[PDB]
Structures are given as C-alpha cells and as structure tokens.
Amino acid sequence: EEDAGLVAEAEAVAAGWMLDFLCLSLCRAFRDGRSEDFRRTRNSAEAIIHGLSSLTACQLRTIYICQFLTRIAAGKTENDERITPLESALMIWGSIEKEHDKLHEEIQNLIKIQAIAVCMENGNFKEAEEVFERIFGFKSKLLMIISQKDTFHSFFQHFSYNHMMEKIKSYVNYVLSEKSSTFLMKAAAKVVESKR
Amino acid sequence: EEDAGLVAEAEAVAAGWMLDFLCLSLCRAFRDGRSEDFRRTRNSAEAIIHGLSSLTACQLRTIYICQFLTRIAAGKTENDERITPLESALMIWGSIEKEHDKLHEEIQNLIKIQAIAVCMENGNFKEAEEVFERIFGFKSKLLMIISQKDTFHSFFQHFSYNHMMEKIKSYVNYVLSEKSSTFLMKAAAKVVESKR
Ligand SMILES: c1ccc2c(c1)ccn2C1CCNCC1
Ligand SMILES: c1ccc2c(c1)ccn2C1CCNCC1
C-alpha cells in the first residue's frame, strides 16, 4: 500500500520546510554572533540542500542567502575556490535574484573594500594586492594604501568591518522577518508557547 | 520582543521532528536499496543530531538505529574505529534499549558470522581471523573454515549475507511502522494527498 513517488514527494516537501527552518536558524546565529551554532546550522543546511534536486525561485534565493552568510562568516579566515571568502560572498551577492537598491549597493561596496582590508589586517599585503586586482582590474588611492600598508587610513574608518557587518545584519533582519511565518518554525513556536 | 531561550527551545523541538523524519527516510532507503539516498539521508541525520545536546530515551534509540543501519550499509566496505563496520554494528545492536527477543538474537548471530564472512568474500583471511578473535575469544569448526578459506561451506548457506539483510529489513519494517505517525512525515504526506 506504499507509492514510492508519493513518498519521494513527501520527502521533498519536508526538505523544503527544513530548508526554511535552517535558513532562519542560520540568520539568528549570524545576528547573535553564535559561531558554533552558525557552524552547526550551516552543516545541517548544506546536508538538507542535497536532498533537493529541483529548486523553485524562492528556494534558490534561500540557499544563496545561506551560501552568502557562510562566506561572510569566514571573511577573516581552499575547497575548489582560488578567491578569498569575501570575494566569493561578493559573487553570490551580485547574482541573488533581488533588487539592487541603495542597501544592496551599500553592502556590495563594503564587501569589496573589506575583501582587501581583511588581508591587510592578517598581514598578507601581497594577497591584498591580488584581491584588489581581481575586484578592481578611488583605484589609484586604494592601491597606494595597500602598497604603503596604510591599514588604518580614514577610508577604512567609513568602510570598516564593523560597518560591513552592521549593514549585512540589517539585511539579515529583513530575511528573518520574511521567513518568520514559514511552516516549521511557526509550528515549533506553538509547541513552546503551549508549555509556557 | 524575542526571547533567546524560547527560540532555542523551538529549534530543539524542530530538531526532534527532523530526527524522526530522517530516521524514517533512512529506513525506507535501506529497505528499498537506494544507496545514494541512504548516504544523503545519513549525512543529514548526522548533521541534525549535532543540533541536539540532550536526548530523551526515545531520541537516543532513534540515533542508535541510524548508527546501526549506517554500519550495516558499510558492511562489505577507519575513522576512530579499529574494528570492522559489522563488528561496530554488533556493538550498537547489543546496547540499544530494546528487548532481546528471538528476532534480536537472530540478527545478532547473523551479524557475528557475517563479520567474518565478508572478510573472506573480500579475500582478506588474516582480517577474517582477527575479527573471529575479537568476537569469539562451533568456534573450532568456524576457525577451521577461515584457515582453509572454506568461504562456501554450508554453515554460510544458513548464516548468509542475504539472510542477515532479510532479518534486518524485517526489524526496519517495525521501526518504519512505529515512526509512521511522527509529526514531520505525517504533515508532509497530507500536503502530497491534497495535491492528488
Ligand atoms: C549553506 C552553506 C553553504 C552551502 C550550502 C548551504 C549549500 C552549498 N554550500 C556550499 C557551496 C560552496 N562550497 C561549499 C558548500
Ligand atoms: C546517522 C549515522 C551515523 C551517525 C549519526 C547518525 C550520528 C552519529 N553518527 C556516527 C557515529 C560514528 N562515527 C561517525 C558518525
């Protein structure tokens, strides 16, 4: 009395629910700075995403948000990539199916500058120069900064790591708001409120 | 307006639901012989299980069933273990909180003999002897069989790999029956039936 095609469909429905639940959990961990919870949720999201072979426009946006937050999280720290985590986040950011509003351009430019600045902070100025060449192939001034190891120039005061994280966290808050109504989290919260 | 403790509770409720759903999916993949689906479901189960730090008596049984099926699946094929997959399945089997009925003892003895026989099938008779020593430290007859490379002796006709898989699959059917009513799969099926 069991139809394998209907069971495969029930598993894909459940995977879709688990995906949204894990994106919400990844968003809250990123917002709260819970590193180990972020790492655990990312692993679960990546594993659940393998149980899906066809994704809708909304599901593709969800996996790309998880991929984006994963690269941002590894920003100051392969596997098939010859670019830096922040350069990889920049490629995900520019190809998400989303409006290129002021907030999008703010995040994009903050990531572009921080991709260079995190290399300078870590003491690898040859890498900072290689990152600048891949992103920017202000250019003359920015190149002089890398060359002189001017890590604390006032340009990096406005285009700081903290500012990049603040703008990304505001975007994360919109994603948290949009996904708060998803099936899995909503049902889980009702169980918690009933206890209680 | 957000309580982190209540959100952590909602995530643990959802993890409990995802655990049961993935155990059911692991059970059907094992029963249907869907190897790649089994590998994918096992990875997701192992990742979701990390999002839990305190497990109930029922949840511990669920993770040990997943661990057991994983070792059985790798039977004919480390990571912190100096024993063979089937020897490791034998340790999980003997410590699950479950009645040691005729079916339990049938599965236990079939695994004990197959742990030796899979080494003989793979042509490693020194390993078959090392496995026999770890499990059996019939003994005199079984040791003569390994020594003479008597892989096709009639003892292995009754205690065959196919018989081991058949008895394990019957146990899997009981687990599938017991977990069919779990929240995640039940809700997923209702969506499929509504479409149809
Ligand atoms: C969350 C985080 C990363 C994720 C997913 C979901 C899905 C895929 N990935 C990457 C993609 C880049 N390489 C490593 C695996
Ligand atoms: C499904 C399958 C294996 C699983 C789990 C769930 C949870 C833990 N493990 C093992 C335990 C042995 N070492 C490798 C990880």
The three-state (H, E, C) secondary structure of B35-59, written as one string: HHHHHHHHHHHHHHHHCCCCCCHHH
Q: Is B193 a domain residue?
A: no
Q: Flag whether residue A185 sits within 8 Å of chain B, measured between CB atoms.
A: yes
Distance A131 CA to ligand 2 centre (A): 40
Q: Which domain holds residue B8?
A: 4-77+79-188
Q: Is B120 a domain residue?
A: yes
Distance A14 CA to ligand 2 centre (A): 22
Whole-number Å distance between alpha carbons of A132 and A164:
17
Q: Is B122 helix (H, G, I), strand (E, B) or coil?
A: coil
Do A66 and A26 contact (CB within 8 A), yes or no? yes
Q: Flag whether residue B26 sits within 8 Å of chain A, measured between CB atoms.
A: no
Do B13 and A186 contact (CB within 8 A), yes or no? no
* Residue bearing the CA closest to ligand 1, atom 3: A67
Q: Flag whether residue B192 sits within 8 Å of chain A, measured between CB atoms.
A: yes
Distance B186 CA to ligand 2 centre (A): 25
Q: Is B97 a domain residue?
A: yes
Q: Is B154 a domain residue?
A: yes
Q: What token pair was written down for A39?
A: 């790492």
Residue B30, Cβ neighbours under 10 Å: how many? 26
Report the number of distinct structural domains present in chain B. 1
Q: Is B167 a domain residue?
A: yes
Residue in the block written with tokens 């409990």: B16
Which of A:114-153 have CB within 8 Å of B? none
Whole-number Å distance between alpha carbons of A125 and A104:
28
Distance B11 CA to ligand 1 centre (A): 21
Cα separation values, A62 from A21, A55, A56, A73, Å: 10, 10, 10, 17
Q: What token pair was written down for A75?
A: 């920003």
> The domain spanning residue B31 has which CATH number?
1.25.40.210
Which residues of chain A lie closer than 8 angstroms to B179, CB-CB?
none
Which residues of chain A lie closer than 8 angstroms to B51, CB-CB?
40-41, 44
Whole-number Å distance between alpha carbons of A59 and B142:
56
Probe residue for ligand 2, chosen from B24, B44, B63 as the CB with the greatest number of ligand atoms within 8 Å: B63
Q: Best mutation site among B24, B192, B193, B194 for testing chain A: the one with the most A CBs within 10 Å?
A: B192
Amino acid at the residue A67: Q
CB of B129 within 6 A of ligand 2: the answer is no
DSSP state of B181: T
Q: Which of A43, A184, A192 sits opposite B47 (nearest CB)?
A: A43
Q: Is B194 a domain residue?
A: no
**Whether A17 and B184 lie within 8 Å, measured CB to CB:** yes
Q: Is B102 a domain residue?
A: yes
For helices A35-50 and A4-32, what crossing angle results, to 10°?
160
Which residues of chain B lie closer than 8 angstroms to A39, CB-CB?
none
Whole-number Å distance between alpha carbons of A164 and A112:
10
Alpha-carbon dihedral sign for residues A32, A35, A37, A39 = positive
**Whether A9 and B43 lie within 8 Å, measured CB to CB:** no
Which residues of chain A lie closer than 8 angstroms to B44, CB-CB?
44, 47-48, 50-51
Q: Is A97 helix (H, G, I), strand (E, B) or coil?
A: coil
For helices B139-147 and B125-136, what crossing angle results, to 10°?
170
Whole-number Å distance between alpha carbons of B108 and B118:
15
Q: Flag whether residue A92 sits within 8 Å of chain B, measured between CB atoms.
A: no
Alpha-carbon dihedral sign for residues A148, A149, A155, A157 = negative
Distance B150 CA to ligand 2 centre (A): 34
Alpha-carbon dihedral sign for residues A185, A190, A191, A196 = positive
Do A176 and A28 contact (CB within 8 A), yes or no? yes
Q: What token pair was written down for B44?
A: 């997701």
Q: What token pair was written down for A69?
A: 């937050």
Chain B residue at shortest CA distance from A18: B18
Cα separation values, B129 from A47, B93, B116, Å: 38, 22, 7
Q: Is B170 a domain residue?
A: yes
Binding pocket residue ranges, ligand 1, CB within 6 Å: A 42, 45-46, 49, 63, 66-67, 70
Do A41 and A77 contact (CB within 8 A), yes or no? no
Reported structure resolution in angstroms: 2.2
Q: What token pair was written down for A44?
A: 């679960």
